[PDB]
Amino acid sequence: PLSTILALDLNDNLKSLSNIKYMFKGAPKENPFGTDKDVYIDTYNLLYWLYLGEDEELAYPMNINYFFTEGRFFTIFGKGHKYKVDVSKFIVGDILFFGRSDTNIGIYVGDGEFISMMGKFPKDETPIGKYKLDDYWNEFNGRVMRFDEEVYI
Amino acid sequence: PLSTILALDLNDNLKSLSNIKYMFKGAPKENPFGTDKDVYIDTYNLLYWLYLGEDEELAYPMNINYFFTEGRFFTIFGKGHKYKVDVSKFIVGDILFFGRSDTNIGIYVGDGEFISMMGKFPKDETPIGKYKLDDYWNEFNGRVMRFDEEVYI
Amino acid sequence: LQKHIESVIRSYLNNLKTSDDLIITDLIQAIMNIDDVLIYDVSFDNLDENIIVPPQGIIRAGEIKVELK
Amino acid sequence: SFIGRTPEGSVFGTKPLITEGSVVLIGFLNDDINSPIILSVYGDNEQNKMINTNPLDGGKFDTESVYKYSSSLYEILPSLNYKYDDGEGTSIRTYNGKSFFSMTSGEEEKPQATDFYTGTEYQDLFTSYY
């Protein structure tokens, strides 16, 4: 699939992407992958740039309102329930939400992990990195989505 | 009547009263008619100066609270109904109210017109002028009053 | 009445068999059948000559505009 | 209005104002006399007529013009300073003496929440009248 291949490519290149830096609402106009210079990007913009590399375009800045009405996603699990046993059924490339008000999102990777940027709020200098799901499982909020390209337009 | 004669005199002298200027709550201490110098007066103060020329005095600044308890007026039409056919029954010298919170008032003149000051809020340099009732009919609010001098005191 | 005439004409256009010319006499007799007295006369602009249909042609679609005199 | 207890154990709730000489509807338990409960508090026609600033006699609520005046969450505290909201952008709140807080967006209503010269007086606000 497209989303699984993109997640695998991001995982393979995760250690070379240290130029990318964390910010609250970093919306730079320069593509991070097409420039050796450091750049502050958040998770939403990161996903946008990652999907823009191929033929899909989506829209910018791709805020939380994107998932409501654009019809690019179909929900897998709803918000408000949180089961630890049904995490194994997930698949790579599923988007993982975080926070009580959709503050941050993530991309799921196998072996019970996820890819996201975590750091102090006021523009942290920590680069992108992968963390275990055990400590962040409290703030998962049970919302899960998935991509679909064949039928759209 | 007193109010009809005063309205006719104001209409006849309307084109010579260009010295008078519009403001939100202009309460000058100088009489506009007794001075060639320009002066910023609002509709309430204008009516006060117009009635003060004769033997009637009323009170100053003559805000909206004047019409409530002074007993100088008796209502003709109440607020909250707005009929376009019953405008013809009006007579010259009836006070026309404007705005949802009694922001401004006017004096009715025949042929479906009214005399008032209209302009941008922050102390507009537009002088007094007469406008058609068709465009302002939306913001009329249906409140109409009339004067009575014989029985008062 | 305009809408009723449009619907009657469009319905006449449907439920028509294959390989028959667009005869106008039957059309006008069909629309005059509604009321002989009320409806006075009917005329046409371009299809005054019968349109010969091939063996594999059927006249079923068609947009109707009523132009009352 | 609402009452309960939190998981920690602390109790929370409300204490709505109680007034003497008000009319209250009562529903007996199992239709037994000597088993009363108060259902709600209903005011008199005069009292209701005094505590509303709506001049319209009547009209369907779906009319745009009627929505301007009908849609008004008008409330008055035990203190005679009141609180006001409306379906339009006007919203007015009052405090001790003539002090008040107000907001609005329409240019027509601009005097209601202006600060030109000395500012708008408290008597200029139509909601300030019975």
Add this chain to the structure above:
Amino acid sequence: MVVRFQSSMGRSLKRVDSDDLNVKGLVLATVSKINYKYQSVEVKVNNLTLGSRIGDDGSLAVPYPKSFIGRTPEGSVFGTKPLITEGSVVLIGFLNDDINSPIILSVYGDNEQNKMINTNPLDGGKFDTESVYKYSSSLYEILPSLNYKYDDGEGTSIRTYNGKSFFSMTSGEEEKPQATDFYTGTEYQDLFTSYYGNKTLIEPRIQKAPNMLFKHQGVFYDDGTPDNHITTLFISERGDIRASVLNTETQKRTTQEMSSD
């Protein structure tokens, strides 16, 4: 027999009389028309209309519940006027179980309407659970104006005004984006309370920017001298800010002004 031919009803024999005329219980109705001057509505039964006599509004109508109402020792009357809506379902209780004696007890909304005006995603669960307390405990309310007010058992609290303007507060670092001012600040669509239950944004009714002000004044104080200090915190629609202190009788003023530029 011959004498049995009287008013009767039911499969079992029951003397129909003036007891059957009296209604037993409470019934539902819809608000068709409202008397705005008296704030007493007339409710419609499925094929009958209650209240609604020759009396226009005052002398006959159906009373509506009030939050509280009374009179002060000085004599001045105080109370509330809760919002009234047409086409809402209202529960009615007749006095002494007499038809032609209605009163409205409360206003109950439809299942769809209730589902639309709540942001709680949980299907169910005991209220005593800590996690469920986060979402269950939410005094969520929406004014007649489509700008809403929100409170919660957590420290989050959100209030909205005309256009996209809002006021918010919170304490958890997790919730820090909801009430942050980094760069341009948090957008209105980032707040999860700003959406309806069915994945729809709560549009404000009025998009024009408001203008706020906090006017302060009095009359006198314990010193006995007349009060004449006036101060304001006016905010314009173009973003200006003006903090001013005024003494009107002495004709003195000091203003701190901020321009939109």
Add this chain to the structure above:
Amino acid sequence: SFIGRTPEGSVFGTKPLITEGSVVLIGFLNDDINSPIILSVYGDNEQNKMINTNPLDGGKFDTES
């Protein structure tokens, strides 16, 4: 508290807080069992005594003090 729809069509209303284990008064429709509605929520005497700061035992409301 109140609920309705605006002329534009948008729905507005309120969601008053709901609490588990509170006592609620119920009125059946047409006095039929299997037809319940909640009328209001009444707290316990202890709960009411805890959530009020009024020290007065009693007295007419018309007194200034």
Add this chain to the structure above:
Amino acid sequence: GNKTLIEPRIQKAPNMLFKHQGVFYDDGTPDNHITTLFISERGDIRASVLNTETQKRTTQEMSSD
């Protein structure tokens, strides 16, 4: 009522803000003035006026120190 302090549930300090914005006005031009009255958990105060389209800002900031 029973001589007990009403503890707040959450002891962490809040952070307030009064964000103001619109869309348009009677002049017809698009509205793009943004202003805030943000207050941080560490006691800071920041009154700011912003025009985002023109990329201009004026802030009055107070630090916790």
Add this chain to the structure above:
Amino acid sequence: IQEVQAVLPEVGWLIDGDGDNEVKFTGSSAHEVMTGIIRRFIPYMKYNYTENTIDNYLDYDDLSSWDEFEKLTEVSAFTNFDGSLKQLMDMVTARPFNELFFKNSEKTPGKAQLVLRKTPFNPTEWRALDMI
């Protein structure tokens, strides 16, 4: 009838209580109301009589009541849930101030008459009754 809207495309009735089966009867006296009540349903109550219906056999005329003391009335059709016209007739009667019963028509032998008159306990109305 519970589930009938009876709407129309971009048209509607100015009087309320329309579309629905609501019917309102108005009069300033019992003989005015009772005429409207009886006349509303009596003709349509059809039967297989070889010759007419109940309106030919029942006069239901020469009704009177206290017109001076009774104001205008807005008596509703459906005051009684699925009740009989007799149940709705009782409300209009307002007993015991008015006396309703069925009796033979002495003035017109051969047919019955519905009587609705003020109670004969008044002095002059008592004298107006025929003695036997």
Add this chain to the structure above:
Amino acid sequence: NVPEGTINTIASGSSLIRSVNNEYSFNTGTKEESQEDFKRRFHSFVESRGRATNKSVRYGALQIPDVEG
């Protein structure tokens, strides 16, 4: 023949109606015609048998019951 401003209500739901009033009095309510009126009418009828006369057009236009003048 009620006076002016007598009809106040419509005696129905009146949801969209505020009030009803009449600006003019009712004068067409009249009792049965006396002998003298009938004799006057009949003398005009006898004199109106020849058409094409003003006195004939008088009866011509007076035959409608509602017309008085």
Add this chain to the structure above:
Amino acid sequence: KRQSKRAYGDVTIQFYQPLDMRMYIPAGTTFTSTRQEYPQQFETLVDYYAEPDSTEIVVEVYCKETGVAGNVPEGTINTIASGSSLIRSVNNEYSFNTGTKEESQEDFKRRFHSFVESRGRATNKSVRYGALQIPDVEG
């Protein structure tokens, strides 16, 4: 001869506002009219669903009475049973003109002629009758 065909057509629903959530229409909803000239009923055969953000929905309807009375003129069917408050107006945009009475004596006579001429197989008319004998196919 074959029996009459039930009238059928399209009916148009107008709501006060676009639906905020998806609504379900119960099967066998009854559509009728208020004019005394056409008291003939109608009823739906299949389920229908009114998705949100849709100000109108069109569902097909079949005349229960078997006759030409179903061929109602425009703007006749102005009533709906078990309808919610959301519905604002009910109207058919086009007259049905599909109902029919029992098969015409002339059309039966002509089909019987076709059958008689079609007794000799292997000819144009035999193929014609063999094609026309199915009730669905026409002309």
Add this chain to the structure above:
Amino acid sequence: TYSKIMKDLSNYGRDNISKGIDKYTSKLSSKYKNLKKAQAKKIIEKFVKEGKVTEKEYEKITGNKVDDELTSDNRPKLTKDKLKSILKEKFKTQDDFNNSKKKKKAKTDALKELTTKYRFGNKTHATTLLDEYIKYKGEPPNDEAFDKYLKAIESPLVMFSRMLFNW
């Protein structure tokens, strides 16, 4: 339909549209099923704030031929040989079948013109043809694959109440 969309916004006016943009949006999307909820939501926001909408705004919202007025009066038939030709344009090299990424782009471009430009449009039907076309490498064993899109495009309450009446 750029003109009609703009005329509609000009008919209600910015004062009326500004009060209930979400539901007024549903009016436009109801009338024309070419615009989804998000597409018509964005154009109205751009209309109210700027006060007008140009051809740059329209095309930015969604790729359309704004400079083409033919279609509303007359739109071509798309008989079978035309579809056969349009598939020969959309698929010109064999790698497209092997490389799925461009195949998704190709088929979307086929459906985008094929549903809109011609007399008859359907997604699921046209998809079905494309799935058979792709599987057979663009030469299926029967010409029906090219016919297919052309021929495919053009109680308890009652029972209880009844029996209760019967008894």
